[PDB]
Amino acid sequence: HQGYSNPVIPGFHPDPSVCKAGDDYYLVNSSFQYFPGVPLFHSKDLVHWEQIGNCLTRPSQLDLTNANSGSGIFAPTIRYNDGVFYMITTNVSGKGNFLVHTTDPRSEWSEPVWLEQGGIDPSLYFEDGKCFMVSNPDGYINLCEIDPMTGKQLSSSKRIWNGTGGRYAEGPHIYKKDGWYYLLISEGGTELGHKVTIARSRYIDGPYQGNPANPILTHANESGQSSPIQGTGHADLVEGTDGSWWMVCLAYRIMPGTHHTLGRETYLAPVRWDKDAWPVVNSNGTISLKMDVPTLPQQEMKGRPERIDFKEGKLSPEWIHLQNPEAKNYIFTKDGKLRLIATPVTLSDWKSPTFVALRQEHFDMEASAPVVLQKAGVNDEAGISVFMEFHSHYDLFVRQDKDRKRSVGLRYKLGEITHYAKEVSLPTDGEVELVVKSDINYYYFGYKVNGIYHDLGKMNTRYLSTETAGGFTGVVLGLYITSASKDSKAYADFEYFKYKGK
């Protein structure tokens, strides 16, 4: 009933949108180049969230050809109306705006319903048996009516607002309260200038008048400059079960030199919203890591296991691939290991490698996995990659050398640099466990064989940040295999994946 920590969903979980279905809450994030797309969460208290799945789970729903950290799936919105869940988003690597729907969030969602109105950050609002769509073509918030089942546009598009004057007006959502249509948007861009602004009108099609107190949430001003959280924005308003008001929003945690590697994460703020009043977010339009505020009655949810095993023969919803995966290269063995089949595709090829990953969700963490490389030709490799983008990733691996010898290598890919930090000869018997640790300053790398851990050294975190590497995503930790030899049938088995955050 009192207090929680932010972020409520750590690591790469940007552009949160939430809906209330009775006493249940469901939340979606943008996923960019990753498959499956649009992670889908469930909560009873807005604080604790369980990933129950992903909205885009089949190739027919999600074409990621040539997608990267700056393309693919952008901000999604989730809405619940009359027993139907709708998820509306943009695929910028494909045909643009669309939605999918379902009556059961845990089931397979529909095929895409492609939409006419352009721009990005589409969102839906329902009233009087009608479905209204907003998005942001040419920087203007546009409104139209749609049939959400057929995707047919039923009214002409109208420009309803263009924000307070701040840059990159996006994330529009309409709500109705106290006889006003409230239009909430993001301005300022998704870096340090991020802010949430709100306008209202007696008519859904305007004219909209801005809140004199805008912005309603931002760390861009003097009041936020010292905060370890920056870039607060892309909010979605939601009602508590007790009639209180809340918002989910994105933000990030800054690192030295103004860097962030954990992506934009999902944050929660309380909102005061009196009858006939404008909303005020957490008193002064800021949020904190420790939120000492009343909450809905709290219920803990299932999280990521400290040791993930593959005995069940199914990866949980948390696991993500680069672009559209070659599904036959990920298999589960008789003794319950993850088996990854090699292809020649490296992690720098801008195509889908045999690569599957979990988001890094803590500054201080340790992750590890045993690696059993088999049927390998010379220079075939398998291991763990600390991955931001095809041009920005640190790779720790077991490599097949000549004469049945093997080694552990550590390779840093940064633009035109491909730097071999270490190449260490292995003992011919002994299962190798590869180990990646981190703190806010460095990744540390090592390996364990025959009960002895060996340090392979460290590398700065800043080179994998969004500020350095570009794009819209966060660091992921991936298991991978790449062949580089004539006619290779190499594969590698991974018995578990350990992840523990401090």
Ligand SMILES: OC[C@@H]1O/C(=N\O)[C@H](O)[C@H]1O
């Ligand atoms: O990518 C175009 C805009 O740039 C931004 N921030 O820098 C906004 O979030 C995008 O809408």
